[PDB]
Amino acid sequence: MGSLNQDATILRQAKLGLSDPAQSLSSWSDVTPCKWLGVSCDATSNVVSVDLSSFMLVGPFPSILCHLPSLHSLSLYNNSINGSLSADDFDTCHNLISLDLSENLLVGSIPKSLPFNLPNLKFLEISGNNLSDTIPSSFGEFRKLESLNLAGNFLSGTIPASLGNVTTLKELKLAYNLFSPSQIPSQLGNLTELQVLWLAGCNLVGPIPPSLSRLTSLVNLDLTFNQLTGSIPSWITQLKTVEQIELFNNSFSGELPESMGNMTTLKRFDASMNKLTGKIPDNLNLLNLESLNLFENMLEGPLPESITRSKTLSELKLFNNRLTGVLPSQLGANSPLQYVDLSYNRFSGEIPANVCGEGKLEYLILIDNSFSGEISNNLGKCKSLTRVRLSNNKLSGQIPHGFWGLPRLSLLELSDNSFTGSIPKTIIGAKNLSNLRISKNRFSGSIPNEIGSLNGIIEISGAENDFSGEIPESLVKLKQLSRLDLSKNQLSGEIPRELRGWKNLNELNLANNHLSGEIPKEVGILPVLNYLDLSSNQFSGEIPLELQNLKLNVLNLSYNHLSGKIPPLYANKIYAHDFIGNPGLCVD
């Protein structure tokens, strides 16, 4: 009765200083306090823990809760706790083990007296607020603290060296603050129990200090978005339990350490956006590897064959390097490969047949290589694929019949290869297709009528091929179509007179075909057309006067069989190059 009375009173007093518009604390306003929402008691009915996470509470920090004599845990995570923290706010909180104030609206400085008022803390989080001034040097005085998270605030100055005394620390998160340009303090090497060090976006400069080799329990090292320099130290290779190394977007140079391949515990490695030179290490036995990212470096050599030992590898992005040679034939066969971007390298040889072996492959990006040969029929059955960019390679042969109608395929970019054949009527199946980009190839046959059913399509770019027959009347009823480029082909016939469906059409480019008849009147009514190229055709008759409604970047009706008079808007001599090569055409 007594410790229930005391505690119910303390909790209700706390509640009256907060505002609760979602009515999260209705259960506080007949029943025992130990069964109220967010409230936990020990066996003698004393409140031990108060967890109000995600309760939409608004108001100052309810320091009255610290008057609860057995309170060890307080969470106000993800609320709208506002104002600043006073010294006095934690006067009575000396029993607390856990304090979580992350995701609120706190402003002002962290109190310097906090460690004196909170001597027993193990877990302190104030992540994602608007805190400012410096991290107090007095933080070195915590004798028990295991996890410190001040990530995502506006804290200034430099990371205090005194933090190195807090040798009970297993996690230190200071990422995403406004520190002055400075080095990683050497004293942080004292924190030999650290498993997580997250100093991303902390304006760090210089090398990773040598003293951090003493952090042999690191599981996660994350130093992304700094200007760190020097080698990636090879002692990361002899971390027995390392799972994640994140170094994206620094100025690291030299080579990846050669011994990397023996890091069996490693799940994720990212050293992208650096100045790394040399090769990818070989004799890789990276068994637990899920993700490797080395994009935007100056790496050279092959992708080693021993990457196929990584049977859980799902993400591989090495784009924007100087990588050479042929890729492992067995790549993907025994991996759940999901995202693969090897663009802008100097790879050669064929694309592995079983790259989508386990059916998980979504992105296959290989822009700007020298890949050769044909696309496997296995890829043509890879229904997981959403994004496919194979442009600017040495590829040839015919595309698999199933490859044009994969359900989730959004981008099919094949341009600037030697691909042959006709586009099959199985393209009807590609219900999510936005962008077809097949310029500069050697395709032939008709453009299928089935394309018109794909209501998503915004782009049909198939310039410089050998397409023939008429343009399907289907293509008019594609409300979302933006760009139609079928220039430099063998297309014959006319344009449909009815074009009101093309509300979003911006570019229409049909130059260098065998097209005929008059230019439809409704081209001038099209509300967002800026590009119109119908030159090098056999278009005859009078130029419609409705084209004067348009503001065009490009207007080219040259080298046709046109007749009559040029519309008066385009009468001036600067437009004259747009109409040359037409027998029966003059200016007034």
Binding site: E103, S127, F295, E315
Partner: peptide, 12 residues
């Protein structure tokens, strides 16, 4: 509020 500690999803 805060980006997660993990890989970059920059791709072409």
């Amino acid at each position: 509020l805060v980006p997660p500690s993990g890989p970059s999803m920059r791709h072409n």
